[PDB]
Design a binder for this molecule. Structure first.
Ligand SMILES: [K+]
Ligand SMILES: [Mg+2]
Ligand SMILES: [Mg+2]
Ligand SMILES: [Mg+2]
Ligand SMILES: [Mg+2]
Ligand SMILES: [Mg+2]
Ligand SMILES: [Mg+2]
Ligand SMILES: [Mg+2]
Ligand SMILES: [Mg+2]
Ligand SMILES: [Mg+2]
Ligand SMILES: [Mg+2]
Ligand SMILES: [Mg+2]
Ligand SMILES: [Mg+2]
Ligand SMILES: [Mg+2]
Ligand SMILES: [Mg+2]
Ligand SMILES: [Mg+2]
Ligand SMILES: [Mg+2]
Ligand SMILES: [Mg+2]
Ligand SMILES: [Mg+2]
Ligand SMILES: [Mg+2]
Ligand SMILES: [Mg+2]
Ligand SMILES: [Mg+2]
Ligand SMILES: [Mg+2]
Ligand SMILES: [Mg+2]
Ligand SMILES: [Mg+2]
Ligand SMILES: [Mg+2]
Ligand SMILES: [Mg+2]
Ligand SMILES: [Mg+2]
Ligand SMILES: [Mg+2]
Ligand SMILES: [Mg+2]
Ligand SMILES: [Mg+2]
Ligand SMILES: [Mg+2]
Ligand SMILES: [Mg+2]
Ligand SMILES: [Mg+2]
Ligand SMILES: [Mg+2]
Ligand SMILES: [Zn+2]
Ligand SMILES: [Zn+2]
Lengths: 109, 77, 91, 114, 97
RNA sequence: UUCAAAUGAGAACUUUGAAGACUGAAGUGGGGAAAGGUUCCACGUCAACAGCAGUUGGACGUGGGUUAGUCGAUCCUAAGA
RNA sequence: AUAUGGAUUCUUCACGGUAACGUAACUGAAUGUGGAGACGUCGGCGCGAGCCCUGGGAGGAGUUAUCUUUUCUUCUUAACAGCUUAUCACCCCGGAAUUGGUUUAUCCGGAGAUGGGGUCUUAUGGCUGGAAGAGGCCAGCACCUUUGCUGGCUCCGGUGCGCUUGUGACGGCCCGUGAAAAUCCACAGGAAGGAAUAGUUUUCAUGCCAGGUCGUACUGAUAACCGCAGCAGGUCUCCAAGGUGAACAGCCUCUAGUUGAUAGAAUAAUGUAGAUAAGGGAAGUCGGCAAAAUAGAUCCGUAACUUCGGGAUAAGGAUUGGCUCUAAGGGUCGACGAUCAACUUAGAACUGGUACGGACAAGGGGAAUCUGACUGUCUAAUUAAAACAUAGCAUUGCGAUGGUCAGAAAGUGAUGUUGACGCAAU
């Protein structure tokens, strides 16, 4: 079987030196250096992967349109749908409870 | 390298004022039944991308070659 | 079938370290690897992370606890004492 | 190729030709995974095709997680026997309820004529 | 039905060849389902004097035809003067040198 | 290791062909890091070196050769300075 | 830097979907928030790639006394782009015990399971463009040169506890929970600027310009490094074919590489290395030193003692080849039928100079005593041990204006990003 060599001067099997063995149109086997895989962006509230947001290396996000990096909702590509809904419910209920607490304080005096 | 499918879009691309070269490539493929047909690829060299239109109809291919602008450097074969 | 008569989880240690030490380690390894009831969601899904950290796989709530048990008896006593003193302070 | 063909026909596989343990030659875990996967896919196929209901499926799934079944043939024969027993019980209960209904009808007409 | 043609005109006109013997060898040695000589309505080998034609419905290939032709040439010490060469697909010839 | 041919004043050791072998992919294979610094390659060439030899060489003499927006350095911070 | 097109706006800064969310766009300052960068190790399982094996066919080469539809070999597809494609996760309907679903591994479900229908990440795979014009394998011509051409084929599958590697969802482990920063993006917010003989939008498409400096040869070692040298030493790492075999073991082979060690002639003693040996079997010797014996796998069987975990491969036995069969263990499609596919185990007969883990490969065992619990560590270059360490046990100091220890001194320092379940000294 044909054997391959690193294409860069790094001879060590480090995280940044991963290679794949591909066959070229010349009919031979050659190493191709593969970038480290991207990590899905994660919700800032619960930590789950954010649905609908592309998974790219940090600087690749500068080369894609806004549609790839956000979701049409109140917190886009920052918080997940369930965490946004929980934020809505908490905000509304706590403001209502603030109103009732204020009136209770006013009517207990 | 991009593939296009609209004849009108290809004709628009052929006049984009930065396209100065095209190529017409003839292939001898088979139409999923063993019959050897003539496939024509029109490849227009844009500044950033090479646009390829694939036509499996030799008559439509000849019509497109006739309709190509006369200042395109058509580069048959 | 019952694979070991008494060593239990400490069968991994073989014949080493002494029977008394293996028993003492066995008790606390059983405690630290046990599943505990989540006080928040009511599910038997609380497991230890590092020492003193106990996380529920459901509802993702983590509570600070003992090194090998979720709640030490000293901490339960301190909780009761603090509840009593808070009640005396408020009334 | 000739030696591979001979091995496929089963030659050169005796005790004098084995140097690794049986587990080394073929893991018992691999064998069990194969057996349990064929048992589970057969159970799922039967449940989807309606040959068994979900309760018998659950019982047989737990039994197949237990050893309880030498192979697919054993599971199929056990399913056959279980369904035969279920049919027997159902027929017995149907006949008992038919006899009860007959007796109730006779009692009713007796009371209406007496 | 697949057709394979062999142009023997060059070595037959250069004297040292026998198209009839080569064809007879083809019927006698072409195997069908492992058995030789059992070419019952499945392999036909016809002759014209310059072109040997094989029509096959059973398992047959140009590789097998070349193998049998090389065997025949070796048997008749006709190698190192005759080559079984493919000009077009399933169209071969006996190049003479 | 062997045979023949070529070259040469001179051939066990150079070259080519033929043969016999080995490393047997954790190589006597193909690349690199440190280090070396031209040892790379071509031509000429054997006084010295290659603990025999030498027409050969990592030798001697003269030349040629290392082409990047994308590979690295450069930038970041680590222990630390 | 930019001009068009596209988009948006008369309801100024978009529409659609119940929703998860979708898109070619679809304003967004300060400030703040979040994410990526960004992370351990092992185990099994799934998937991908490359390799391996293999069928048909289209070419070339080898063998052909005989046999071999035969042996070898080519049949390939990059970055990038468009469409599409997952596990996981999420959404809508619904309310489940006769509890169901489900992994190799037992987790999940009224905090909403199963089920039905959808959304999403694009690792990855598929098709297409790149791209057959390339590369590969051939054929037929011509050749004072440059060698010139002219044609053909470069296709369709299968298989898996296979190897290497990547990855996914998990599980085990910790008094160990296994970097940081540059950088990039998103979100909250609404500062500000915005339309109607017209405004907005360089996160949509296309278009224009530029991208400097230094390194780049070669060896990387039984000759390019270090060891005084062309030194049997030392020196970090990537890829990794077939067979036998559990195997990256040993042995043989393919690709690639080498055939380099001063040679020739004899075959004395004594050597170095490898071996054999009648009968005896440690009587040798300080001492079984050295050597021999054993060895793989399957089946049987396994004592004292024990911290119950082991001892244990205890001990001690039987078998193993070849060949011809038999049986069992599966996938897919519609109790069976059709079809496809790979090995593992068991058994039987036959057979031979009773041979068969036939080369290779590969435990000697037992009864006890002293000693150290064990794994581990050291005198590199005469000592590997009972020595050191170790977990365990115990003692000591210290509550920070402190204990222990540094510094010539300091507005100095280690423990200390520490606080008695700690640090320090034994
Ligand atoms: K999106
Ligand atoms: Mg194995
Ligand atoms: Mg097991
Ligand atoms: Mg020599
Ligand atoms: Mg030679
Ligand atoms: Mg060897
Ligand atoms: Mg060898
Ligand atoms: Mg040189
Ligand atoms: Mg010399
Ligand atoms: Mg000399
Ligand atoms: Mg020189
Ligand atoms: Mg770079
Ligand atoms: Mg729109
Ligand atoms: Mg569900
Ligand atoms: Mg991809
Ligand atoms: Mg590795
Ligand atoms: Mg280089
Ligand atoms: Mg090199
Ligand atoms: Mg090397
Ligand atoms: Mg040196
Ligand atoms: Mg094997
Ligand atoms: Mg003797
Ligand atoms: Mg004897
Ligand atoms: Mg004896
Ligand atoms: Mg004696
Ligand atoms: Mg004596
Ligand atoms: Mg003595
Ligand atoms: Mg010895
Ligand atoms: Mg034994
Ligand atoms: Mg013993
Ligand atoms: Mg010791
Ligand atoms: Mg060990
Ligand atoms: Mg020493
Ligand atoms: Mg020593
Ligand atoms: Mg000691
Ligand atoms: Zn969230
Ligand atoms: Zn919980």
């Amino acid at each position: 079987a044909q054997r391959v060599t690193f294409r860069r001067r790094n001879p060590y099997n480090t995280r940044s030196n991963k290679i794949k063995v591909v066959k070229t149109p010349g009919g031979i086997l050659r190493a191709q250096h593969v970038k480290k895989l991207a990590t899905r962006p994660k919700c800032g509230d619960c930590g789950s992967a954010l649905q609908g947001i592309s998974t790219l290396r940090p600087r690749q996000y500068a080369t894609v349109s806004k549609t790839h990096k956000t979701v049409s909702r109140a917190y886009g590509g920052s918080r997940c749908a369930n965490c946004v809904k929980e934020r809505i419910i908490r905000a509304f209920l706590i403001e209502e409870q603030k109103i009732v607490k204020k009136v209770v304080k006013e009517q207990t005096e | 390298a991009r593939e296009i499918t609209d004849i009108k879009q290809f004709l628009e691309l052929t006049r984009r004022a930065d396209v100065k070269t095209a190529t017409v490539k003839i292939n001898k493929k088979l139409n999923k039944a063993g019959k050897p047909f003539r496939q024509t690829k029109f490849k227009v060299r844009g500044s950033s991308s090479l646009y390829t239109l694939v036509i499996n109809d030799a008559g439509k291919a000849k019509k497109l070659i006739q309709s190509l602008p006369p200042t395109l450097k058509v580069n048959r074969l | 079938a019952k694979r070991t008569k008494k060593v239990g989880i400490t069968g991994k240690y073989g014949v080493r370290y002494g029977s008394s030490l293996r028993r003492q380690v066995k008790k606390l390894e059983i405690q630290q690897h046990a599943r505990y009831d989540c006080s928040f969601c009511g599910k038997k899904t609380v497991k230890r992370g590092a020492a003193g950290i106990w996380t529920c796989s459901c509802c993702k709530k983590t509570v600070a606890g003992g090194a090998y048990t979720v709640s030490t008896a000293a901490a339960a006593t301190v909780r009761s004492t603090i509840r009593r003193l808070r009640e005396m302070v408020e009334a | 190729r000739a030696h591979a063909q001979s091995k496929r026909e089963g030659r050169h596989s005796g005790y004098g030709k084995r140097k690794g343990t049986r587990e080394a030659r073929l893991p018992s875990q691999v064998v069990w995974i194969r057996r349990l996967r064929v048992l589970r896919r057969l159970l799922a196929k039967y449940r989807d095709a309606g040959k068994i209901d979900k309760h018998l499926y659950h019982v047989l799934y737990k039994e197949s997680k237990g050893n309880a079944f030498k192979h697919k043939r054993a599971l199929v024969e056990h399913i056959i026997q279980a369904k035969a027993d279920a049919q027997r019980e159902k027929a017995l209960n149907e006949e008992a309820e038919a006899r009860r209904l007959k007796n109730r009808a006779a009692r009713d007409r007796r009371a209406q004529r007496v | 039905a697949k057709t394979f043609t062999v142009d023997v005109s060059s070595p037959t006109e250069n004297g040292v060849f026998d198209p009839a013997s080569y064809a007879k060898y083809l019927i006698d040695h072409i195997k069908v389902e492992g058995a030789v000589g059992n070419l019952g309505n499945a392999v036909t080998v016809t002759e014209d004097g310059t072109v040997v034609t094989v029509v096959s419905t059973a398992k047959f290939s140009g590789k097998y035809l070349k193998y049998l032709t090389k065997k025949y040439l070796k048997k008749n010490q006709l190698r190192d003067w005759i080559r079984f060469v493919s000009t077009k697909t399933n169209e071969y010839r006996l190049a003479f040198y």
